[PDB]
Amino acid sequence: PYHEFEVSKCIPERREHAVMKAAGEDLTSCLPKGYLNTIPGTISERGCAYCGAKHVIGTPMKDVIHISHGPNGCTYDTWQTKRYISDNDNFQLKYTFATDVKEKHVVFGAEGLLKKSMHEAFDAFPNIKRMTVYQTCTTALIGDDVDAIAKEVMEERGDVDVFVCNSPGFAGPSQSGGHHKINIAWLNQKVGTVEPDYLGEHVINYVGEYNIQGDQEVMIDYFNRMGIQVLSTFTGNGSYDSLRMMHRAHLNVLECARSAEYICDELRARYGIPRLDIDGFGFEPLANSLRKVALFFGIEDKAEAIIAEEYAKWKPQLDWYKERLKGKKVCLWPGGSKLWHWAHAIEEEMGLKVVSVYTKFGHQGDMEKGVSRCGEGALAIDDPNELESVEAIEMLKPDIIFTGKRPGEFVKKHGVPYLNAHAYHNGPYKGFEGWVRFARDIYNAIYSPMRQLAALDISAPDAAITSGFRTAKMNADLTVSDEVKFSEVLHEYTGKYDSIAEIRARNQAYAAEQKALRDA
Amino acid sequence: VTQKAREGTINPIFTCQPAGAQFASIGIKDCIGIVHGGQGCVMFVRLLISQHMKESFEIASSSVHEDGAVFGALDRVETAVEVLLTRYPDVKVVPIITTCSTEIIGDDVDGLLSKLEDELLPTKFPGREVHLLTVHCPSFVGSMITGYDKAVHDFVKKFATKDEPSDKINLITGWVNPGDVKELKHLLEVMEVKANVLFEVESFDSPLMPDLEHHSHGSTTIEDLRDTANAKGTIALNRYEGMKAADYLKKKFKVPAVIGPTPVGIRNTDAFLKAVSEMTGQPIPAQLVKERGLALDAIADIGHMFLADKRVAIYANPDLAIGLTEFCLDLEMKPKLLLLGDDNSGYVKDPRVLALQENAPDLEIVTNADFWDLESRIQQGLELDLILGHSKGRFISIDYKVPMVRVGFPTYDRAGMYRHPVLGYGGAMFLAETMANTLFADMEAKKNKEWILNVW
Amino acid sequence: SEKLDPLVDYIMKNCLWQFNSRGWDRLKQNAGILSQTCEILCGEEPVHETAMDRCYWVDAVILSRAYKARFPWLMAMTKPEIKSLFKALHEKIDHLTVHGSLNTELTVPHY
Amino acid sequence: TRKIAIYGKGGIGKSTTTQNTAAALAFFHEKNVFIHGCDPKADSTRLILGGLPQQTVMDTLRIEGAERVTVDKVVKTGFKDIRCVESGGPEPGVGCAGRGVITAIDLMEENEAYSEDLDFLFFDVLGDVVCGGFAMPIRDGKAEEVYIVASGEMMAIYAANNICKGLAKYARQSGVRLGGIICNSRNVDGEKEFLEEFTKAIGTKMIHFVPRDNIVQKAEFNKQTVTEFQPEANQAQEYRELGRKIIENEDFVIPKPLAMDELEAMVVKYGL
Amino acid sequence: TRKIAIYGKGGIGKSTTTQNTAAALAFFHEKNVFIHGCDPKADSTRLILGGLPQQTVMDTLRIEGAERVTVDKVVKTGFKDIRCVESGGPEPGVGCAGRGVITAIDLMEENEAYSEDLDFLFFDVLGDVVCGGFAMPIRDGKAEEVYIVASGEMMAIYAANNICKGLAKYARQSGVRLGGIICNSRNVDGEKEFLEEFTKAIGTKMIHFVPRDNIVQKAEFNKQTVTEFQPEANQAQEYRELGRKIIENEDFVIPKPLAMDELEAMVVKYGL
Ligand SMILES: Nc1ncnc2c1ncn2[C@@H]1O[C@H](COP(=O)(O)OP(=O)(O)O)[C@@H](O)[C@H]1O
Ligand SMILES: Nc1ncnc2c1ncn2[C@@H]1O[C@H](COP(=O)(O)OP(=O)(O)O)[C@@H](O)[C@H]1O
Ligand code: CLF
Ligand code: SF4
Ligand SMILES: [Mg+2]
Ligand SMILES: [Mg+2]
C-alpha cells in the first residue's frame, strides 16, 4: 500500500511516491511514481540535468577536455566532488574548464568567447586532442549555437574532435534528463566514426560503469582472465576514441541500466548488438554475471575457474563479517541503480535486513526492480525530501544508512552511522574482494566503540562510565555463538588499503603482453 | 598588477554569486533560503558547505524545469514558500536567492514578495512572523564573494530599524570560520565590548549529543539584525564581504563605519583593536598585551630561522588573501604570487594592494585569476616553498611537491580546519606554527636538511 | 498455483532480464528466455538464428540451472506438464512485467 | 513624474507615436519629457535626436563595463530638450536583449537618469514581449500607466488582448494599470466600431484615434516628428490632442482579457 | 524539400503573407506545405487551420512532458492538407520565448515531424529577433533560404537592414541565403522605388510586390486565407504569383548591409 508521511500531508502529491511491501501484492498492485517534476520548497535531494550529463557520465572520460559553456559556478560546483579515477593520471579529476560567461556575453552572445576558450584549452594542454562542450542554464537559454562553434574549431585545428552535450540544468526533472540526453547525443554524433584497430575473438562493450574508486578496473581484471576484449567502457576509465568504436562489439554488458540503457537499446536496435544486464556487486550476482558473459562466448570454464579461485580466497573473510552482521537493519538510499543492485545481495550475503530503499531520480523501472528485490515491509520512496527521511528513520530505527555525504552528515546528527553509497568509503565495492571491503566498512561503522560512547550521558547520576578500551570485535563477538567466535576458518579482511594498485598493475601487464603478441 | 589574459577558466578559484548568498543565509537563526532556479544550484552548494563543515544545512529550491524557464517560474517560488513554511513551522526568515537562469528570464521576485505578504502569509499562516526578502544573484556577475557581500547588505536592509540607542557596535566579520568568530568574540569580551556579530557561526560546529538531537545552524537573530541601526558604529573586517552593508547603515541611519583591516597577523590585529577602542572608548587591557606577547614568542622561535626568505603563493577570499600576504611579509617571507580570483575592480584601488606593489618587490598580483595561473607559472619555472590556499588547489600542491597550508573556504582535505582561527593573536600563532610545521614535514619528506630540526 | 509461486518468486528476486525499458522489448525478452528455459528443462537443445537468441540462451541456461538446483520436482514431471507449466509461467511474467504493469514508461515510443 | 510604458503589436506605430506625442507634449504643452527606448535595434529616439544615437547603455557596458556607464555618455538631448536614452543590445539572432533591458533600466535608476523635474517618462518597448525583461518597464518603481497602441486589424487587436493578459498578472503584483488603447489607424473597414467594442469588452477606453497620414512618413524620412516638421499640420494637431488626452487621463484599470471564443465571435460582423 | 524562414519588421505581414502563400502553393500549384509558427502568441496558422490551434508544442511539454510530445498531438492539418505546428510560448512579460522556440524545433526534429515528401517548410518567425533562439530556424539542418518581408516605410527597411546584419553570422555558419525581399505595400509614396533601390544597394531583389487590399482583412475576419475566401480575387492571384516566383527562384545571396549613413542618404529622395 501507498505510504503517506505525517510530514507530507500538506502536499498530497507525495502519497503515491512511497509504498510499503505487503504480503499478497505484486508489481501490478501498487508502485511509486517516478521521473516527475519536483515539488518546490520540499528540500528534496534532486540535482539538475547538467549534473546527470556532465558530472555523472561525461567527466569520467580520461583523455578529454571537459569544458562547460557558462559561468564559472557550474564548473566549480562539480569539481573535486567525484571519485572516478583513471589510468590517465586522473586528468579528468584535476582539470576543469569553463568559458566564464559574463554579462556582456549574456547580452551580446558568448559564441566568440566559447571559440576562444576552446582554443585556449587546447593550447594549454597540447597532448589532449578530444573535447566535450556542455551547455549550462545560461548559454542554453540565450541560444548559443555550440555545434557550429565545435565545427569551426575542429576545422581550424584539423587534429581535434569535439562532442557537443546540450543538457542545461533546467532541461529535465533531475539527473535523469542528463543521462538520456548525453546517451543519444553520443550515439548520434560519435558512434561509428572510428574503426577498431584490432578485434579479438570475444569483444564486449562494458556499459554503464563509471570507475568509482576503481570499480571498472576490478571488472576489467576479471574479463582479462576470461580472455575477453573490452572494446570500450561507457565511460569510467574510458577513452574518447574507443567509445567511438562501440558499433563493433559482439555484446553489450550493461551494468547501470538507469544511466546507459538508452545507448544499449539503440545499439541493439541499430547494429544488432545484444544487451546483457549484469550485476557487479555481490558474490552470487557477480558469479552469475561472469558465467553469462563467458557462456555467450562459449568459454564458460574460464569463468568457473575465476569464481572458484575468488570464492576460496574471499568467502571465508566475507563470512567472518556476515556472522557478526546478521539481523542488523540498513536503509538503502543511493540515487539510482545501487538500490536494486544491493538490496537482495546484502540481505543474502551479509545478513542485513533492508528496511527502506529510495531513489532520487530513478524511473518506475528502478522502483519495480527495487520493490521486487526487497523483502515485505520495506519502504520504497521516490524523490525523497529531508523531512521524509527523518520520519523514516524514527519509524524504522536502522543500524546503518547507505546514502550521500551530506545526507550522511544529517543522519549522523540523529544517531545513525552512514556509509557513502555514492563514493564508497574504502572502495571499490565491486568484485569479490570489494564485497568483503564493503562488509568490513559496515561492520566498522556499526560496532565502533565511539558509537556507544556517544550514546552515553555522562551527566546522568548513575552513568555507565568505564575506563580502558573496547574494540569493534569485542562488541561484535557479543552477538555470535561460541562456534562462530572460535571458528578456525573465518578470519577478518586481509587486504591492502589500496586494493586497486595491484589490480591496475595487472591490467597493464596484460595489456602489454597482448600488444606484444598482436604486434608479432 | 596582472589581469589574466585568457578569457576562459581553467580550474576556477571561486564559485558563483548564489553560493555566496546561500552561505550568508545559513548564518542566521531560523532562516532557510529558497534558491530560485535549477536544483543543481542549491544541491551543489549544500554539498560544498558540507565539504567545508562536514555538516548538513537546510537550503531549499524552487526547482525550475524546462516549462518553468520557458513559461515563467514565479509560481514555483510561490509554491516553494508555502511548502517550506507549512513543513518547517520554526522558520522566520526566508530569503529568495535568484540564479543565472531566473536572472536572465527576468522573473519579478520582488513584486511576488508583495503579493505573498498581502495574500499568502495573512491567509494560510495568520499571526505567524515570516519575513521574506530577495537576493538578486546573477552568476554571470561577480563571484561568491560579491554574492556574500550583497546578501549581508540585503539582510541588514530588510531588518535594521531605528530605535533606542545601544552601546553595542556592529561587527560584520566577513566570510570566516567558526574558529575565527570565537577568536573575535574572545577579543571583544576581554575588551568588554558588546557587539552585534554578523554572523554567529560558532554553532556551525554542532555536538553529537547522547539524547537530544542538535543540528548545525546559525545564531544571528532577527533582533541582532534589527539592532544594527542603533549601534555606536560598524566595523566591517572585509572590504569585499561586508562594506556594502556597513555603507548602507551609515547612509541610512548615520552609523559610522570603519572598514578593515582584516585582523590577520599581529600588526593587523593591533589595528583592529585600536579601531574598536576608538569606536567604543574602551581601553586595550593588559591581558591582550599578554596574549599578543605569547603569539610573538611563538613567532620568534621560528621566524628568522625557518620563515625568512620562504617563497609563498597565496590565494583565498580576497581580504584574507591580502591580509595573509601582509602577514607573510611581516614574517620576512617572500610572497611571489597573489591570486585574486574574481573580476572585482576595487582590487587595483585597494590601499592595501597599492602598498603591496610599493614595498613587496618580487610579488606578482593576478586579478581575475584561476588555478592555471599558479600552475602554469610553476611549469614555467616559479619556485615556491609554500602555498597558502583552500582545498581546490590541492592537486597543484600534490603534483608539484609544494606544501600547502589550508586557509579560507573550502578546506575539505584536512580535518577540523574550521575550528582554528586565522584572525587575532591566537590565529597569528596558529598560522605561523602551521606554516612552520608544514615546512618541517616537507623537509622530512624530501630529506631536505631534515637533521636541522633538533636545536632550533 | 503451488508450482508458479516459487518459479516467479525466484525470477523476480534474482533475475534482471525481465526489466527491460520498453514493453515491446520486454515481450521479446520474456518469450525468448522462457521458451528456451522450457526447452532446456525438457532435454532439448535450443537452436539460435540470431545473436539475441544466444543472449536469451545465456539467461535461459542460468535460470534452468537454478530451477534444477532449487526445485527438484521439475525433473520428475513429464514434458507435457513442463510445457503447460512454462506456458503458465510465461503468461504470469508477461502480466507482471507488461500487461498489468504500472510502469507507464513502457509505452514511450523513443528509447 | 508620470512614468508611462507603451506596448502594442509589432510595427503598429509605438515608436512613431511615442516620439511624436513627446514632441507635441514638449512643444504644445511645455512638458519635460524623457524617452527610454527598450528595443535592442535602438530606433526609439531617431525622430527626437535627428538620427540614431551612437551610444547605447548596452554598447557602453560592452566596451567599458557597467560601473563606467554614466548619465552623460548615453543620455542625449533632442527636440525641445527632450532627454533620450537607448537600451541597446545585440544584433538579431544572438545574445539576450531581455537581459540587456533589465540591466539598462537598472543602470539608469542607479545613476539617477530620470530627473525629479520630469513631467513624463516614456518607456518605448518592442512589440513582442517575449520574456520578463521586456516587462521590466512595468515593475514597481517603473511605469505606473500603460498605453497599448492598436488598430482595426484583427492581429493587432489579438496582440493587444495578449498584452492585456500579461498585464493582468503584473496588475496584481505591481500596481501598473492600463490607461487606454491608442488607435493608430490602418484604414480597416469597421476599424472604429471594432476598437470601441474591444475596449468596452475588456474594460478600457479608446483614448484617441490617430489617423493614417503620409506626412508622418515624410517627416520620418526627414528625421523628425510631425510637430518638428510641420507644427500647424493636421497630424501634428492629432498628436497634440493625444498629448492633451494623456495629460487629463484618470481612468486606469486592470484589463479583462477576452477568451479567444469571445474575440472570434466579435469579429464576425467585420468580415462582410 | 525547400525549407524557408520568414523574417521582417514587426507586424509587417509575415504571418498573413506566409499563410496566404502556403494556401496558394497548395491550391494553385499542388504543393506539400508545412508551417512551423515560431511566435509565442501562436497566431501563425490561424488562417490555415480555420481558428487558433489549441495545442502548441510548448503547451504539450508543459502538460505531458518532453518525452510524451508526439507528432500527432501537436501537428494539425488544415486547408489543402497543409500541416501546421505552433511552437507556443509564454504570455507576455514572463519566461523565455526564445528557449521555447529552440525546444519546439528540437522536438519536431527528434520526432521527425517535417516529412521528406514535403515541398515547402516555412518557418514563420516573430518580428523581434531578440536572442539566439529566434535564429534557430536558420541553423544547420533548418531553413536554407530566408525571405524578408518589408515595406516602403523607413522603419521596415531599417528592420530589414538590421536582419541582414544579424544574418551574416548564419550565412557563414549554416550557409543560409537571402532569397529576396517581399514587399507588403503600406501605401507609401515612392514605395516601389525605395524598395528597388534598397534591394539593389544590399545585393538582393524585390521578389514580389503584394498590394495592400482589404479583402485580406475580410478573409482574416472569416478565419481563412484569401485563396480559401475568394480564389478568383485579385489578391489571391497576387499570392499565386508570389508562390510561383518563390518556386522558380534561383537568386540566393549573402546580403551586404548598409551603414546607416548610406540608408540616411537614400531616404532623402522620398521625403519631399
Ligand atoms: N499614423 C501613421 N500614418 C502613417 N504611417 C505611420 C503612422 N504611424 C506609424 N507609421 C509608420 O509605421 C512604421 C512603423 O512604426 P514604428 O513606430 O517603427 O513601429 P513600432 O515602434 O511599433 O515597432 C513607421 O515607418 C511609420 O512611418
Ligand atoms: N496584403 C495585406 N493587405 C492588407 N492587410 C494586410 C496585408 N498583409 C497583412 N495585413 C494585415 O496585417 C496584420 C498584421 O500582419 P501579421 O501577418 O499578423 O504580422 P506579423 O506576422 O509580421 O507579426 C493582419 O492582421 C492583416 O490584417
Ligand atoms: S553558474 Fe551558479 S551554479 Fe551554475 S546554474 Fe548558474 S547559479 Fe547555478 Fe545550476 S541548475 Fe545545473 S548547476 Fe548550473 S546547469 Fe543550471
Ligand atoms: S526570450 Fe528574452 S530572456 Fe529569453 S533569450 Fe530571448 S531576450 Fe533573453
Ligand atoms: Mg519601436
Ligand atoms: Mg506573425
Author numbering:
A (entry chain A): 2 to 521
B (entry chain C): 5 to 460
C (entry chain B): 5 to 115
D (entry chain E), E (entry chain D): 2 to 273
Task: Tell me what the authors wrote about this structure, in their words.
Some diazotrophs encode ‘back-up’ or alternative nitrogenase genes: vnfHDGK for the vanadium (V) nitrogenase or anfHDGK for the iron (Fe) nitrogenase, expressed upon the depletion of Mo. Upon complex formation, low-potential electrons are transferred from the [Fe4S4] cluster of the reductase component via an [Fe8S7] relay (P-cluster) to the active site cofactor of the catalytic component. The active site cofactor is expected to follow the general composition of [MFe7S9C-(R)-homocitrate], where M is Mo, V or Fe, depending on the nitrogenase isoform.
Using anaerobic single-particle cryogenic electron microscopy (cryo-EM), we solved the structure of the adenosine diphosphate-aluminum fluoride (ADP·AlF3)-stabilized Fe nitrogenase complex consisting of two reductase components and one catalytic component at a resolution of 2.35 Å. In the dimeric interface of the reductase component, we observed an [Fe4S4] cluster coordinated by Cys97 and Cys132 of the two interacting AnfH subunits. In our structure, the [Fe4S4] cluster is 17.7 Å apart from the P-cluster. The P-cluster is in the dithionite-reduced PN state forming a symmetric molecule, connected by a shared sulfide ion and bound by six cysteine residues of either the D or K subunit. As previously proposed, the FeFeco is an [Fe8S9C-(R)-homocitrate] cluster that, in contrast to the Mo and V nitrogenases, contains no transition metal other than iron (based on ICP-OES). Intriguingly, the G subunit contributes directly to the binding of AnfH2 through hydrogen bonding between His114AnfG and Asn112AnfH as well as Thr111AnfG and Arg69AnfH. Indeed, B factors around the αIII domain are the highest within the catalytic core of the Fe nitrogenase, hinting at an inherently flexible character of the αIII domain that is stabilized by the interaction with AnfG.
